[PDB]
Symmetry: C6
Subunit: 176 residues, 6 copies
């Protein structure tokens, strides 16, 4: 891939005691894109052949995999970014009803993804072994995970990023 | 990949009490492209090695796989987009027989994909286990699925998107 | 991949009661490229590990695979496109012996691929089970297929596309 | 990929009773590039997991694979093209010691690849089963191939292309 | 991929007895990008199917893999680069609070990645066999590695690069 | 990929009885890039699943693989090119301490890679079977290779290329 190949005329800088946010926020935008693609198919890209189930039950790997991973972290992120992406191309150029409502959209989205995330991954963690007692899964069986530490780390990162994103997003939203 | 690298001169905005749709609709277009590619080969990209059949019948996985998945969701989407894509490059620039018939085409296509979809995936769902009683499949056998929840989610999304696409598509088609 | 990243100066449109074809035909060209790459290695890309032969004969999968699939559909297509591709870059710009003979080439190629296709895939179909009685294949054995429905669908599409390609190709070839 | 995205100013055409070759030859160049990439990793791209050896000898697949396929067809082609590629960018623009020697280089290379090819693939063919009696391969064993017909076809094509390449290459080399 | 396709107007060179660093540092930047992508998914890209565990314990490969590889080297690098990347696009053009603090950021990051690295890979090495005594891993079991020498080599390289990066980074930071 | 898409203004040619080298050397540069990428992940790209070890020792494939292949040929090449790459972008434009020292760097690097190579692959060859007597590898075991002939061929090529690279590199370095 390659994303962004024309940014040369940016001599105009800020002078006020504000609009520091847009710097921080474009930086976090670009950042999160890199951070994503660089580790995109490269942490969670694997986790299909990595959910070993101690059994001889047919299918129970698939069963428990959806049971505990309806969706992977990186998708909720990918979405979180895209919904939080549309205000970016908006704020690309501003001076001359929406504009600040773009800022607010950007806030509330990111908030939503945080909440529903912690609803799903309660404990902000990756259990080393998830058991499973699904229908075909004849009793409570065991179902492993690879690299739970890893995924936990990058999750801590992205959530911290979400917090700072919103804090400057809102710190300039709160101009009154 | 990278799609779209020249859009700078768009200072001209709308002033009437209409043409809000074209904003919404170009946004939904770009959106659905991202939404697609980001999760393109990344939800349904897997589902070949993910249709476990409890048996010892040769081939019965392939048999039942085509039996229940003639085609995957994402293809019907891919098509739905492309047939609904041609009016986009048309409406790229408009002011000066087709033009509104492009709008109507865009409506009726998306409608068609909705209908035939629900004909095929009746119940707007992903069954956790599809049985199968095909010729080689000696009796009614079991044939699993992975991530049925996941696919169900993104299907709910794309169908909602279809509804809103058409509603603004038609809301401006209905100018009289 | 990415194909085509410079098309901006196309303000000049047609005014006659003809040259509608070139619109349709460039559209079908671009279309078929997308249609291809999007589903390229994604329907027939699999079909090597998908030709289960009920036997214990060594090699009989390979034997019968070539026996019934000398070549896959998508190759005959790929070729069909490429031979039908050279007139495209020709007709890129036209006004000022070949020019109409390019049109005729484009016709007759596509016709040829249709005929030889139906010679090979007689019945415009994908049999769910092909038997096989090759030399090593000790008796008439069974040899399965995956997703025969799928491949049948996309074949119906590409052949319909061929028909319309030629019909406008020739409708403007028939100017007299 | 994408190769070639700037060719617009070519209004100047030929008027003599020659230089038809450069048309044919640039066309064959572009052609062979397409023809290659389209079927590049798509006929011979597979043939690693496709050389079944009826045995229980360890390694004998690798052994016999190198034994009968030191190198695949498509590499000899890839090279054949590249060595025959350098005169192309040379002849990109010509009018104002090398120039005709570029033409001759282009001839003799393509000739060489033809000869050494037929030295290696004697019979211009793909045997359905190659036996093998290598050291570890304990007796004469059997070692299969997939799609030998296919590869034979595309080989017939590329060799015919080589013949016509040289014939026009030389027909204009023979100007005296 | 392709990164960087517009750098032509650089006739202005340095004349002082300093700013040699920016040459060295842009070179190391570009370098490390190449060095990365060229060997990116090509040394550590494999190491999922390469951690053989002498056992019959289910999952113990995944268990011990995360146990000893929470994260691979190349990720810590990828990050190290990206955090050390933002000052680069800053120092792209300079003459006319941040500017030198960008230099200092660039220092301290790279330092941090060095330290935490050696915390994790103590001994600046790749053990040929890591044992493992995890919960499911019933006793102390054995768990192999592939190419430990290789990875050790490229690690020695990247750490040396870090040292020189910082030494010139700081040698020009230390201007007083 | 695609590398190099702007080279049009090169009407200025050489007239002296020298600077033939820069032609040869840019050609060899471009060449080696093509030669690489075309066969890059396509000869040595495989050799992970291709090192069959006649045993029942766990891990002994990995063990002996690193034992005999610390690093693959194509990496030593990749490096050899990159270290020999920096003088290229330097010599892109020259007329108006480094310049000739770039030439000398280019020499001595390529020399180094030759020497250390032959230190490692002594005999300029690919043994059809490497035995192995590592710790876990319980006795002297056997460990196979695929396509040793192939790799030998392309190695002969790249080393010859190195020789000619240096000979013209130095023939113009030796101007006095």
């Amino acid at each position: 891939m390659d994303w962004g190949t024309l940014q040369t005329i940016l001599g105009g800088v800020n002078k006020h005691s504000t609009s520091i946010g847009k710097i921080w926020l474009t930086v976090l935008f670009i950042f999160r894109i890199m951070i994503l693609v660089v580790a995109a198919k490269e942490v969670w890209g694997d986790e299909q052949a990595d959910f070993v189930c101690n059994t001889l039950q047919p299918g129970c790997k698939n069963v428990c995999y959806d049971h505990y991973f309806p969706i992977s972290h990186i998708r909720l992120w990918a979405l979180q970014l895209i919904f939080v992406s549309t205000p970016a191309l908006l704020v690309a150029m501003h001076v001359a009803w929406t504009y600040t409502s773009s800022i607010f959209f950007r806030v509330i989205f990111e908030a939503a993804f945080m909440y529903v995330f912690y609803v799903m991954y309660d404990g902000f963690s990756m259990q080393r072994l998830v058991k499973c007692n699904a229908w075909p899964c004849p009793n409570t069986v065991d179902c492993f995970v690879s690299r739970p530490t890893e995924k936990t780390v990058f999750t801590v990162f992205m959530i911290a990023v979400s917090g700072i994103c919103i804090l400057l997003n809102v710190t300039e939203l709160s101009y009154l």
